[PDB]
């Protein structure tokens, strides 16, 4: 259920939702352009909204830690989708040479 950045790309090309579970300030500083923001605490409170649902959902955070440690929560939050966790988070995505959007001041 953990997915490489390259394999996540292939899924996104087929309509998979990429969900960034970090906070807005983190997202605004640097994010994956395809990603939809939905902070974990919001998802825990009010659930995954219909607009972010799809047959395949990939979650990511900073370095893979928050996704790994909240795997069970995320499995329920996105049920009954096919659910994936991005290996090493946005840091992994960056290490793989894939594009990010960085705030210019």
Curated annotation (Swiss-Prot):
Gene Ontology molecular function: thiosulfate-cyanide sulfurtransferase activity
Induction: Part of the ygaVP operon, which is repressed by YgaV. The operon can be induced by tributylin (TBT), a toxic chemical used as a biocide and in textiles and wood preservation.
Stretches in topological domain Cytoplasmic: 1-105
Keywords from the UniProt entry: Cell inner membrane, Cell membrane, Membrane, Transferase, Transmembrane, Transmembrane helix
Topology class, membrane: Multi-pass membrane protein
Highest taxon of source: Bacteria
Regulation of its activity: Sulfur transfer activity is inhibited by S-nitrosylation of the active site residue Cys-61. S-nitrosylation competes with S-sulfhydration and causes small, widespread structural and dynamical alterations.
GO cellular component annotations of the record: plasma membrane
Subcellular location: Cell inner membrane
Active site residues of this protein: 61
Keyword Translocase: no
Domain Rhodanese: 12-102
Catalytic activity: thiosulfate + hydrogen cyanide = thiocyanate + sulfite + 2 H(+)
Enzyme Commission designation: 2.8.1.1
Quaternary state and interactors: Homodimer.
Function comment: Transferase that catalyzes the transfer of sulfur from thiosulfate to cyanide to form thiocyanate. May have a role in the detoxification of cyanide to the less toxic thiocyanate. May also be involved, directly or indirectly, in the transport of the thiocyanate produced across the membrane from the cytoplasm to the periplasm.
Notes on the domains: The catalytic reaction induces conformational changes within the rhodanese domain, as well as in the transmembrane alpha-helices.
Protein name per Swiss-Prot or TrEMBL: Thiosulfate sulfurtransferase YgaP
The gene coding this protein: ygaP
Region of the whole protein represented: 4 to 108 of 174
């Amino acid at each position: 259920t953990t997915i490489s950045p390259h394999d996540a790309q292939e899924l996104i090309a087929r309509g998979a939702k990429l969900i960034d579970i970090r906070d807005a300030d983190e997202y605004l500083r640097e994010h994956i352009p395809e990603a939809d923001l939905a902070p974990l605490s919001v998802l825990e409170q009010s659930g995954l909204p219909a607009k972010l649902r799809h047959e395949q959902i990939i979650f990511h955070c900073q370095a893979g830690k928050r996704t790994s440690n909240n795997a069970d929560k995320l499995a329920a939050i996105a049920a009954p989708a096919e659910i994936f966790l991005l290996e090493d988070g946005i840091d992994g995505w960056k290490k793989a040479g894939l594009p990010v959007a960085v705030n210019k001041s």
